């Protein structure tokens, strides 16, 4: 039981880390568009 609980807790970390990484990717994309404008 306690190891299953720990594994489930880690699963919540995996889901949240993925959501944060997606947000980070979004930030890079927002910034790349700004860089393309300055290059233009």
């Amino acid at each position: 039981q306690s190891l299953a609980n720990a594994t489930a807790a880690q699963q919540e970390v995996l889901e949240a880390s993925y959501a944060m990484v997606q947000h980070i990717a979004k930030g890079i994309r927002i910034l790349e568009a700004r860089v393309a404008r300055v290059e233009a």
């Binding site: 039981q1 190891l3 489930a8 995996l14």
Partner: protein, 34 residues
């Protein structure tokens, strides 16, 4: 940059699939332990 974009989309698709499978397996283990 277009290649970088195509590649990040592939990473995301595959990671989402792996996360879903892990979540399912975690549920099965939780149910077995209960």
């Amino acid at each position: 940059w277009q290649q970088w974009e195509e590649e990040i989309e592939q990473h995301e698709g595959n990671l989402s699939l792996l996360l879903r499978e892990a979540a399912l397996q975690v549920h099965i283990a939780q149910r077995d332990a209960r």
